[PDB]
Amino acid sequence: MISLIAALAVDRVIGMENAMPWNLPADLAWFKRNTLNKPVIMGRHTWESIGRPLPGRKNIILSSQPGTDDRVTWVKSVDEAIAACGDVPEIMVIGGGRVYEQFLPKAQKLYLTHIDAEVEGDTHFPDYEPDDWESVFSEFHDADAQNSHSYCFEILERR
Amino acid sequence: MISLIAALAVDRVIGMENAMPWNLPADLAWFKRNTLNKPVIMGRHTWESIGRPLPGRKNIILSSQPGTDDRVTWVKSVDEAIAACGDVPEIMVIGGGRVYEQFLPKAQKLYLTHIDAEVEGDTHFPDYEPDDWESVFSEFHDADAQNSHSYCFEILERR
Ligand SMILES: CN(Cc1cnc2nc(N)nc(N)c2n1)c1ccc(C(=O)N[C@H](CCC(=O)O)C(=O)O)cc1
Ligand SMILES: CN(Cc1cnc2nc(N)nc(N)c2n1)c1ccc(C(=O)N[C@H](CCC(=O)O)C(=O)O)cc1
Ligand SMILES: [Ca+2]
Ligand SMILES: [Cl-]
Ligand SMILES: [Cl-]
């Protein structure tokens, strides 16, 4: 199946012109746990913001552009990115907006990190109706010595 | 000599207990370049927010309560914080709040990272006297795909 994993501030904001104003190591840890040893599909701009390949995962970059780095697979079709993942039980789509927009219909699972940050965005996660999705997990956490914002982990599955 | 290093938000607001609402890798590089191979003095809260002993630095924790880990030196006083540093050219006082206050009078150097981030806070960096502190270095930077905020690097010699 196709699963989308995302971090969303208030108003489904997922992006800004600059790096997001939150230091959330727990979320990076949650990200990693849920993507490890699975192929991950991202857009050329998420790839650029990470600056390196995500270890122990199959990095696939979707963009109609001539690939820059040799250490990853570059593709230019939703369908093509899928083929590149081959025979795996779950493909993890990591963003951003347009990449989410393209796999959402295909997605059968959502890994969301709800962050209590009121910020003006550039990109948002597309709307998904609360009745085609079943929340099978929820876990709220307060901001702490290592995390700047409160946050809630959640996983929804298609009804 | 004693130097203090701090990342300040607008209003001289500094971190109290939870992590600050920003993401600035460049300031951690700055912090690392200026503290590496030197003893560092910090209070308890900064210690829990770091999570472990900073590599290549002698970690001295100034607290009144019982030492948690053992990779680090724990002290009950400012005068003891010094002795533990032995005689080094520079000792870096890394925060927060209280530790900054107990040392500014003995300070000759300040390494400030002014971040344009309005954070509500109870704690503020001590009031540094203008005509008692001369500016030697100012380096402004714009926010990027990796740094959430615009920031400035500064150095003041007590004169
Ligand atoms: C921009 N970026 C994209 C990003 C970030 N957080 C997210 N968080 C969630 N919930 N979902 C996403 N799709 C997501 N994407 C990044 C940045 C750093 C790392 C990374 O180095 N962090 C951990 C490891 C933690 C660390 O060593 O700092 C990893 O292996 O993924 C990953 C993705
Ligand atoms: C909470 N914390 C205290 C903190 C943070 N930034 C500061 N920044 C400045 N300018 N000054 C301080 N006193 C300061 N203190 C931290 C947290 C992490 C690291 C750190 O983990 N490693 C850095 C380098 C960054 C990295 O390893 O990725 C290092 O000093 O080696 C340092 C300080
Ligand atoms: Ca249930
Ligand atoms: Cl992208
Ligand atoms: Cl403390």
d(CA A42, CA B100): 43
Residue pair A85/A138 in contact by the 8 Å Cβ criterion: no
> A23 in ligand 1 pocket by Cβ < 6 Å?
no
Annotated binding-site residue? A143:
no
Neighbouring CB atoms inside 10 A of A83's CB total 10
Instruction: Judge contact between B15 and B123, C-beta under 8 A.
Output: yes
Closest of A157, A153, A104, A111 to residue A134, by C-alpha: A157
Residues of chain A by 3-state class (helix, strand, coil), percent to 5: 20, 35, 45
The domain ranges of chain A are 1-159
Q: Does residue A99's CB lie within 6 angstroms of at least one atom of ligand 1?
A: no
CA B12 / ligand 5 centre spacing (Å): 18
- The structure tokens listed for B4 are 């203090």
The coordinates were experimentally obtained by X-ray
User: What resolution in angstroms does the PDB record give?
Assistant: 2.2
Position in ligand 2 atom list of the atom nearest CA B96: 13
Task: Identify residues after which chain A is interrupted (C–N over 2.5 A).
Answer: none
A56 at the B interface (CB within 8 A)? Answer: no
The Cα A122–Cα B62 span in angstroms is: 43
Residue A66 C-beta-side C-alpha neighbours within 13 Å: 0
In chain A, residues with a C-beta closer than 8 Å to the C-beta of B17 are: 145
Q: State how far the Cα of A77 lies from the Cα of A94, in Å rounded to an integer.
A: 16
Closest chain B CA to residue A45 = B145
CB within 5 A of ion ligand 4: which residues? A 43, 45-46, 96
From the CB of B54, is ligand 2 less than 6 Å away?
yes
CB-CB neighbours of B16 under 10 Å: 14
Strands (E) across chain A are located at 2-8, 13-15, 39-43, 58-62, 73-75, 91-95, 107-115, 123-124, 133-141, 151-158
Classify domain A1-159 by CATH architecture.
Answer: 3-Layer(aba) Sandwich (3.40)
C-beta separation of B150 from B134 below 8 A: no
Q: Which two tokens stand for residue A40?
A: 């991950």
Query: Which of B42, B148, B149, B150 has the highest number of chain A CBs within 10 A, making it the mutation to test binding with A?
Result: B148
Contact call for A143 and B18, based on CB within 8 A:
yes
Backbone angles phi, psi at A39, to 5 degrees: -75, 135
Q: Give the full edge-to-edge strand order of the sheet including A107-115.
A: A73-75, A58-62, A39-43, A91-95, A2-8, A107-115, A151-158, A133-141
* B107-115 vs B151-158, strand pairing mode: antiparallel
Q: Is A109 annotated as a binding residue?
A: no
DSSP A89: S
